[PDB]
Amino acid sequence: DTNIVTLTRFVMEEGRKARGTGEMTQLLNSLCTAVKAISTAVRKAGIAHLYGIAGSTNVTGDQVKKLDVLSNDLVINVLKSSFATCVLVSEEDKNAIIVEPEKRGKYVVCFDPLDGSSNIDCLVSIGTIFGIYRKNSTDEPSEKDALQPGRNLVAAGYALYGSATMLVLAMVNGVNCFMLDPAIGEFILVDRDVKIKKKGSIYSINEGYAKEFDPAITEYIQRKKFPPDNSAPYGARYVGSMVADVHRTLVYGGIFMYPANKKSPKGKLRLLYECNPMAYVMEKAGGLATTGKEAVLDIVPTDIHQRAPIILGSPEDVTELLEIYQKHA
Ligand SMILES: O=P(O)(O)OC[C@H]1O[C@](O)(CO)[C@@H](O)[C@@H]1O
Ligand SMILES: [Mg+2]
Ligand SMILES: [Mg+2]
Ligand SMILES: [Mg+2]
């Protein structure tokens, strides 16, 4: 253990030749601290009486859990103090947060402080999702600086509070996974340069919405259950927490779906702090992320709380679904 390959070091080493100010290291170190604090709280939530609701509703009309409040405060406070940020967008706040002049840095951060709210009380895996942009304007920071297409991301990733706590970080040249060592409070590199398989054998979707699915999603699911070539049908997995289903898709291959449907023209998941970060991870891992008609990373948002359909995973799987959408167009 006398040579610890920490997230901090990894991020510093890799970007030593590319010169720079080092605020990204500052930013990520800061986020790592929030993530450890959130992990620790989650791991003892029932004894700390942190299960249950807060007594409020966010703009996308969700019921605010107590862990939502704690996680949101922790992430906002550490990013503010990092001296690396100017504009913050969170699922739990109606408007973009503008950092005080004294603490401003060059980055814009979009995040979901706690993802998988419906799974909190039953102890299923939950997580934290983030996407980081460089501010491009030269005028005063504002919500508009958050309204960039996902392809403009410079880093993105998530923390998974699962059987272990994992920080998955994607940047311009690839994806790397760091596991939290709970004894020393450090994220250790455990998977380098992760790449998704070209084709998997698991599909992930909430089939409770079958009555509302479009014909293409309907056809695809039927094909996973009854393959026309006598191959083995795909297995099904749906934890119910985007971070957990997407993490599995990344390391085992396959496809994850939260499509548009008859009641939800743009799906459920939020483009800025759920769909773009996972789409970015997936594309840097050799995967694809589509709405069924266009690349998620190419959408130009007009609303920080905008929703988007998302279909992601192994490229041959996502492509097969796109072919079906194309055929039905
Ligand atoms: O209950 P549903 O509609 O399947 O929604 C589950 C999805 O909702 C979320 O909790 C976000 O609200 C995601 O983490 C998860 O993928
Ligand atoms: Mg979420
Ligand atoms: Mg959330
Ligand atoms: Mg929620």
Q: Specify the CATH architecture of the domain 194-328.
A: 3-Layer(aba) Sandwich (3.40)
Place of tokens 């492509």: 319
- β-partners of residue 98 are 87
Give the Cα-Cα-Cα angle 46, 51, 56 (nearest 5 degrees).
165
Between the CA of 73 and the centroid of ligand 3 the distance, in Å, is 13
Between the CA of 103 and the centroid of ligand 3 the distance, in Å, is 26
Residue 8 and residue 185: Cα distance in Å, rounded? 12
Phi-psi region of 230 (alpha: psi -120 to 50; beta: other; left: phi over 0): left
Instruction: Give the count of beta carbons closer than 10 Å to the beta carbon of residue 263.
Output: 9
Q: Is 24 annotated as a binding residue?
A: yes
Torsion of CA 152, 247, 120, 92, to 10 degrees: 0
Residue 312 and residue 120: Cα distance in Å, rounded? 24
Whether ligand 1 lies within 6 angstroms of the CB of 240 is answered as yes
Q: Is 219 a catalytic residue?
A: no
Residue 115 and residue 95: Cα distance in Å, rounded? 19
Q: Is 79 annotated as a binding residue?
A: no
Whether ligand 1 lies within 6 angstroms of the CB of 241 is answered as yes
Which tokens go with 213?
Answer: 């699915």
b/e burial code for range 208-222 (CB count within 10 A of at least 16 → b):
ebeeebbebbeebbe
Whether ligand 1 lies within 6 angstroms of the CB of 278 is answered as no
Which tokens go with 52?
Answer: 């249950």
Taking ligand 3, which is a single-atom ion, which protein residues have CB atoms under 5 Å away? 91, 112, 114-115
**One-letter-per-residue 3-state SS of the chain:** CCCCCEHHHHHHHHCCCCCCCCHHHHHHHHHHHHHHHHHHHHHCCCCCCCCCEEEEECCCCCEEEHHHHHHHHHHHHHHHHCCCEEEEEECCCCCCEECCHHHEEEEEEEEEEEECHHHCCCCCCEEEEEEEEECCCCCCCCHHHHCCCHHHEEEEEEEEECCCEEEEEEECCEEEEEEEECCCCEEEEEECCCCCCCCCCEEECCHHHHHHCCHHHHHHHHHHHCCCCCCCCCEECCCCCHHHHHHHHHHHCCEEEECCECCECCCCCEHHHHHHHHHHHHHHCCCEEECCCCEHHHCCCCCCCCECCEEEECHHHHHHHHHHHHHHC
Backbone angles phi, psi at 204, to 5 degrees: -130, 110
Q: From the candidates 27, 31, 68, 288, which is the catalytic residue?
A: 68
Which tokens go with 36?
Answer: 């450890």
Dihedral sign (CA 243, 244, 247, 253): negative
Q: Is 239 annotated as a binding residue?
A: yes
Give yes or no for a contact between 157 and 168, defined as CB atoms under 8 angstroms apart: yes
Backbone angles phi, psi at 21, to 5 degrees: -85, -25
Which tokens go with 16?
Answer: 């030593």
Q: Is 92 a catalytic residue?
A: yes
CA atoms within 13 A on the CB side of 148: 22
Give yes or no for a contact between 42 and 74, defined as CB atoms under 8 angstroms apart: no
Residue 84 and residue 67: Cα distance in Å, rounded? 25
Q: Is 271 a catalytic residue?
A: no
Q: Is 320 a catalytic residue?
A: no
Which tokens go with 30?
Answer: 């800061």
**Structure method:** X-ray
Place of tokens 């055929």: 327
Instruction: Give the count of beta carbons closer than 10 Å to the beta carbon of residue 189.
Output: 17
Whether ligand 1 lies within 6 angstroms of the CB of 206 is answered as yes
Q: Is 62 annotated as a binding residue?
A: yes
Q: Is 274 a catalytic residue?
A: yes
Residue 119 and residue 112: Cα distance in Å, rounded? 15
Longest Cα separation, the chain: 64
Give yes or no for a contact between 270 and 280, defined as CB atoms under 8 angstroms apart: no
Residue 15's nearest CA partner among 169, 241, 121, 190 is: 169
Between the CA of 102 and the centroid of ligand 2 the distance, in Å, is 31
Topology at the third CATH level for domain 3-193: Fructose-1,6-Bisphosphatase; Chain A, domain 1 (3.30.540)
Residue 304's nearest CA partner among 263, 260, 271, 259 is: 271
Residue 220 and residue 232: Cα distance in Å, rounded? 15
Domain boundaries, given as residue ranges, for the chain: 3-193, 194-328
| Chain centre to alpha carbon of residue 168 | 9
For ligand 1, atom 1, the nearest C-alpha belongs to 240
Indicate if 194-328 has the same CATH topology as 3-193. no
Taking ligand 4, which is a single-atom ion, which protein residues have CB atoms under 5 Å away? 62, 117
Between the CA of 126 and the centroid of ligand 3 the distance, in Å, is 9
7-14 vs 23-43: helix axis angle to the nearest 10?
160
Residue 173 and residue 3: Cα distance in Å, rounded? 24
66-81 vs 23-43: helix axis angle to the nearest 10?
160
List CB contacts of 245: < 8 A, sequence separation 6 or more.
204, 237, 238, 239, 256
Whether ligand 1 lies within 6 angstroms of the CB of 312 is answered as no
Give yes or no for a contact between 158 and 129, defined as CB atoms under 8 angstroms apart: yes
Phi-psi region of 190 (alpha: psi -120 to 50; beta: other; left: phi over 0): alpha
Instruction: Give the count of beta carbons closer than 10 Å to the beta carbon of residue 20.
Output: 10
Residue 243 and residue 74: Cα distance in Å, rounded? 19
Q: Strands across the sheet with 202-204, in order?
A: 235-236, 202-204, 255-258, 310-313, 288-290
Residue 143's nearest CA partner among 301, 269, 276 is: 301
Q: Is 52 annotated as a binding residue?
A: no
- Amino acid 99 reads V
Residue 200 and residue 235: Cα distance in Å, rounded? 10
Residue 243 and residue 245: Cα distance in Å, rounded? 6
Residue 20 and residue 111: Cα distance in Å, rounded? 24
Which tokens go with 164?
Answer: 């272990």
List CB contacts of 32: < 8 A, sequence separation 6 or more.
7, 8, 167, 187
Give yes or no for a contact between 239 and 118, defined as CB atoms under 8 angstroms apart: no
